[model samples]
Every structure is written in structure tokens, then in C-alpha cells.
Target: ERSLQRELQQRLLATNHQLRHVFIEPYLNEMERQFSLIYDQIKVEDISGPRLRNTDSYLREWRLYKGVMADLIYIYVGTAERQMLIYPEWQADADFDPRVRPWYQLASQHVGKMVWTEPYYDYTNGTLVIALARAITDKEGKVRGVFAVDAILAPFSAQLNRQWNSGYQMIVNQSGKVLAHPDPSQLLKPMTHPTWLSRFSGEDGIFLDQASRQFVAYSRLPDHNWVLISVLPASSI
Candidate 1:
């Protein structure tokens, strides 16, 4: 039936929505709450040792909240005074400065909103990580610093590789760089952009990749500008 195409498109759209809501949104909500709680607690003048001592309880509370399934790997704050309070001590370089990091700059510019840093490899462990960051402001509405949490993308990438009948799934950004792929080695590589990608007329839809003899269903996760794609052999339909 002609409707089969529409149905498959809807299925992929629903899956993409569910993935965002279930995994990422809740994590952001939790981190935002942490940011609010720590706002009044951060002092602009404490040195690293005292600052770490001051935030000890807050970090403990976060560990209790982290539980088993949350992908959050680190919780930290970098101050306007260039002081850093990080849990688990991942930074080994004595000259490290969090003030100039991408997460800090992005959050400080936006203030009062959570922003995602571009996915990057963690220096400590080499895992792919993305960050959620928010600026902490003083009661006088002056910027104090930025608070951030890092979460690994390896789990999300693994989920994308789950088998779907004879089909396969991947996520790519607007520029066609693969964010997640069924092949682990292919993660973050540039995907060959097919003509249908340019022809996408809606937030999501289905099309035939004539060169590959496959049916492609795709939906854009608007928040991140990442497209969720499922490819199936034309013979399957």
C-alpha cells in the first residue's frame, strides 16, 4: 500500500521523539536543578581547595541522584575568578583553565539557559562526551561562572545500532556527519549525502535511495539538528 511509506516515516519520527524525551530531556532537567541549587552556594573568592571543600555536600547529593542509568560522568563548576570545583578529579594538568572551555563560553553568553557543547572526546578516558552547561549568576544578576555536567554518548550510539528487521539506523547532523552509526568505527565520520537528503520537504519523511536500492526514513531531532535515519533494502518492502 502507498500508505506503508507514510507509516514507516511516522514510526521513525515517533522513535526519535521518544529517544530525546526519555534519555536526554530528563537528564537536562536534573542538571538544571543542580545548577539552581548551587547558584547561591558558590563564592566568587574561594581557592580550589576551599571551593572543593565547600561544594562537597552538593557533589555527594548528585551522586545519590546519578543512580545506575544516567550517563552523567562528571559534575563541575568553573568560576569567574578562574577557580574550578570538579568531582572525581579528572584534570591532571596544573595549568588547566575551565573558564575558556567551550561549555563555559556558550553558557556564559546565553545565561539562564542550558546549552549543549559539540560532542568531543574526553581527555581522561577517550570516551565521546557531550555537556549541558548553564551560567550561575549572582543575585545582582551578575555572571558568577558556569556549571556543567558531562554525559557519555557511547550508550546513545549503541542504541542507534539496534537491529530493526533487515534495516539499520544512524544519526547524522545537518552537514551529514554521522553522530551515531551501526558500525562503531564509523561514528563521527562524514556520511555520503544522498540526493533525497537535499529534497527533504518536511521535518521528516521517506524517500528512495535509488543508487543503493534502499528505502530511507528520516526525522530531524530539531533541538540538536541531528537527523535520525533508518535504511532498509527495497526488497523488504
Candidate 2:
């Protein structure tokens, strides 16, 4: 039998790749494809003004994704004209302006790239969510707006807590906040032993945590700032 450290490392890598391949990659791929199509339609048609909801292409695209992704909460566009079009429309706050939101601002700043926002609490629903967004630009290279989607993370976070053979698993952000843990109360909370965060010096590693007297193994998720971590008592090794 392999040492617990080695075994943990292997499992960390396996779960990292499996989670990205099966869940994360496909979701981003579809979002990219749909966003591209929507971008093109908006660019060609010059979509704007009061009829944002009447746009058939936007509605169709939103419906297609919303039907398949249970985690998706909103697919929307915020225009330079200070207008918004959101699928499965809701009554937005009277003064709601997407440009002021962190997700929209981040996408606008990045311009050519898509971005994933750090998880945040949605005031409207009080659920943790992250946004995937890209800026829309006119042919003249002038940015017209941003397109974004908000997806709740609770269900996916729960999926990451699957029991391990030798230890428990959790996912955490670089800042040491737990993104997913078997214990619901720990979600979004700082790691119990925050100093251990420094030991994650590379993409993946196994180390003995002195303070906690545990063997810690971690693998960074592809394209995200999160890490998948496993912890077991040192004696168990």
C-alpha cells in the first residue's frame, strides 16, 4: 500500500482533473459558445433600447442554457445605454445598473477576455454566487456592454465533499476561505488553520502540517483560484 501522503496526492490530482473535465470545462465551453453567438447577434443587429426582452436570439439562447443548467440563476446583458436584458426576467431594483456591479466592471476592464468573479453573496437571494462575464464591443473597438451569467455554488460545493478513503476533502480559495466542506457552516469561512495556506507552494503538493498534526494534500483547480484539499491525521499515515 502506498503511503497516505502519496495516496492523497494521487486522489487530489484525480479529483481535480475529474471535476474540471466533467463539470467545469463543459459548463464554460457551452457558456463561451452561447456568449459568442449572442455577441455576434448584438453586434450585427445593434440590439438596444426598450425592446431588450423582445430580442428573440437573446431569449432563445438564455432558454437553451437555463433549461440544461440547474445551477444557472441569471443570463443577462448590461448595455452602455444603461439598459438591461435578463432572461427569466425578474423585477430588478428601480435603480439597478449593471455597470456598477463588480462582475460587469471586471469584464469591461478585461475587454477581450472572459472572467470569473470571486464568489459573493447575492443580496436579492442571499445565496453565494459567482459570475462569468465578457465584454461586448462594437466593430469600431468600442465596448458597448457586458454579457454575464450568475450561477449559485451551493449544489456544486456539496458535490465536492464526497467522503475520501483516508480523510475528508474540501475546496478553498487562495485566500484560505473554504468554498466547499462537508460541514455546511464552514463554507466561505477561513481555514481553521490559516497559516497552513502558505504550504501550498505549487499547483499540487503534500505536506505535514505541524500545528494541526495532520497530513495535508492539495491540488489547484485548472483555470480557477481554488484548491482541492484533503486532510488526515498524521498518525493515520
Candidate 3:
């Protein structure tokens, strides 16, 4: 029953540091930014905020073991053309409209809530990008814009893989979808035979990974409806 205190503490810190990066009320300023190893490039771009303020002032932070910089990324939408675009084609190709994009509209829909999107590919660099977004609002409390943070699943999963070195571990969203996992292949697809995920053992418990007769522990994050799981060999028990 006491197997999880350290790992769970790490989970709270890792997950909290990032989710809180943009979710903090200060992010409402669209000028407050900081970077961390696991949560890098804290940036803000709103419908019209950039034009009114200088963004270069946002401090960049990362970590070796402290400042919280992960190889992941943070991003957003809807800024004025001069600030966000470099050329005519950039405008033509970029098309600055947060209202139509999935994360943007999702944030708008949630209105004061955080939402994660299904995994998508970042065509520019060919890495898988996982998006977390929330709607930005105006002084009148109307949906003003969208703020987003993207984590490159590869490294994010790698970090989870380290903490969960039992057999294998993964992080899943409330929808029973994998967010970070040792198996890249599994992260690519959603649960088809959801029943395969049956049996939860303890407070932060295990899954009977029938194939190997393995025992995997499941932990949850308080900030987001996320589950941290680690597979332990039957030998360990």
C-alpha cells in the first residue's frame, strides 16, 4: 500500500508543473511566461494581445534537474500578422484563426477549463505533438482567445518510462486514452477492446497484464484526470 509515495510525489510535481504553467491565473496576462525542463517555452499568444505588448520579455527557463525544462513544447494561437507572420505566404499558409482550430475552439467551448486533444502529428518536424489548450477570455468574461501547450510525446513518454521502470508505464487521460507510454505503438491508437484494461488492485493499483501475467500499478494526477501506470513483473509480487 506504501509503494507509491515517492513516485506519486514525482508525478504530482511533473504533471503539476506543466499543467499549471498555462493554467495559472497569471497566464491570463498573456505576458507572463517561464520555461522548465519538462515544461518549456511558456508562451502566450492571443487574438490581439501581442500587438499591444512586447513578448520578448517572457523569460525562458529549463532544467537539468531543477528549472523544469523538458524536451516538450508549449504553444498557442491568434496573434496579429506582423507579430506572428514573416511574409505574405506565411500569412497565406498560416491563416491566423484560433476559432477554427481544434484546440482553440475546444478551449473556447470549455470556457475556464483545460482540454487535451487526441494525438496529432506535427508535420513540420515529424514528431507527435500532444496538445493541451484552454480558452482565454476578455475582461467581460467572454471567450477572447485560446492558449495552448504542446508536449512532444516521445520525450514525455520517455520520462514516464524512467519513473515506471518496473516493466513499463504510461499516462492515460480520463477518456482511457494513453498520453505517455513506453509503447509508442499503443499511444498511436485508442482503446478498441477497452475491456482489456480490467482489474485494479489497490489504492494506486495494478492491471493484470494477462499476456505476461504481469502486475501493473495505476496512479492518478489530481490536477488532470490522468492515470500513471507501471507494469511490474509477476516475479516482483
Candidate 4:
């Protein structure tokens, strides 16, 4: 388990680094570009004509935005179901479209310009999930919408399973919901009974969860408020 733990920790850290450099950061920049282009077009059209209300055009734009978000989420985070929560358009409970609610409602809501949420499980689908929500605005300083994206937890499991040689490495959130692990059986199961909310209350870093016999590390990404965690058996090292 120690050996597995070390290997898992190293691999997860490597994977996380690679993901940041090759996937997450690049994708975020691209998404920003897309958001800018769409926002610009909307503003230009509004200036030339009546401000576009939520119409077919608006919906179509939103759909395209959703598609982009979905694709990125799938590619970078390995989640299939993803959505964007635009403010004013989709306010809090009002934005809870059944399709979007499972992930959105369960995620940590963004309060300001941008925020990353703690990972959570979709009990309905038994999937590990995380969300990133950002506020977007127009040149005139008007709040435009919120851009939210989600990642499904399975892909990370598949990745970890393939890469690690240890007994297994699991990623769990503050709630102890296993986000990613080699074991398929524990995907949505709570890592800790009644949930372990206090475990993540400290500064971001790595440590050993002795009671669980796992090596755990948590890192906060600069772009969004999301935390990346890596876990493996203590005996692996």
C-alpha cells in the first residue's frame, strides 16, 4: 500500500500537472475566447437593433455555448452531462432545469466573478462531479451571464486505474465522496460515513489519512476555485 501510495501520489500529481498545462488552462483560455466572441456579437447586434431578448436566437446562442461547455467538460474533465448557468437568465432555483439541476444544484455556487466548487456526487447517477462557475460581463460593465461547467467523475477513475500500479488511488472531496478511484465499487459511496466535511477545511496540501490508510493530497487551481485531490493506499510507498 505504501508503494502504491507513492506511485499513486506521483502519478496523480503528474496527471494533474499535465492536465493543467495541456488541458485545463488551454481549455479555459479557449472558453474565454468563445465567451468574448459570443458576448461581442450579442452586444454589436443589440446596438444595431433592439436588445435581443431571450428569443430563438438567444436560445440558439445559449445552446452553442452549452455545447462548447459540454465538449470541454468531457474532454478535460471526462464528464458527459454539463451545463452553463447564466445569471439573470437562469437565476438560482429558476435556473434549475431538470437536465441541469442534477449537477448545478448540487455544486457550490459562485458568488462573485468566478469560483470553483467542491466536488460532489450526483446520487441519481452515482457519478463523482465538480463544477466551475464564472461571471461574465459586457464592455459597458453590465452583468451578462454566468458560465458554468462540470466534469463527470468516471473518466478520472478510468485514467487512474490505467496509470497506477498500486492497489488503488481514490480522489474524494470534503464530503468524502470518492471522486476517482481504481475501484469501481466505491465511486459514489461516501469515503466517510456522515461525510467528512472538516477534512478539507485547512490549507491546500498533501497529507496522510491514516485512519483510511491512504495518502491524500489536495491542490487549489489558480483559474477556478476547484480543488484537485490525489489519494492512494499508504502501504504503496
Winning candidate number (TM-score): 2
User: How do the residues 105-159 of candidate 4 rate in per-residue lDDT, one tens digit apiece?
Assistant: 3322332343435655443454555655444444554334444555544554675
| 110-215 per-residue lDDT for model 2 (tens digits) | 9888887777766465666667788888676676788888875555555555545556677777688776676766766677888877888787777777777777
Question: How does each model score on lDDT?
Answer: 0.66, 0.70, 0.49, 0.48
Ranking of candidates on lDDT, top first: 2, 1, 3, 4
Off by over 4 Å in 4: 1-16, 27-36, 44-54, 71-206, 234-237
Judging by lDDT against the true structure, name the best candidate. 2
Off by over 4 Å in 1: 1-50, 123-127, 159-163, 183-189, 192-197, 235-237
Candidate 3 regions with alpha-carbon error over 4 angstroms: 1-46, 49-68, 79-96, 121-127, 163-166, 183-188, 191-193, 198-203, 235-237
Query: Candidates' TM-scores?
Result: 0.71, 0.75, 0.58, 0.46
List the candidate 2 regions with Cα displacement exceeding 4 Å: 1-46, 50-53, 123-126, 162-166, 182-192, 233-237
Q: What is the overall TM-score of model 1 with all chains considered together?
A: 0.71
Evaluated at residue 144, the lDDT of candidate 4 is 40
Candidate 1 lDDT over residue span 1-237, tens digit each: 889867765665566556555754464465456656654465544433334445667567656645543556777787776677666566646566677778888988888777877766665567666677888776666767787877654555666555455777777766676666667666655676646568565777667777887777776665666677777776664
Locate the minimum summed-lDDT window of 10 residues in model 4: 74-83
Query: For each candidate, how many residue pairs have backbone atoms clashing (under 3 Å)?
Result: 0, 0, 8, 14
TM-score between candidate 4 and the true structure:
0.46
lDDT of 4 at 17: 57
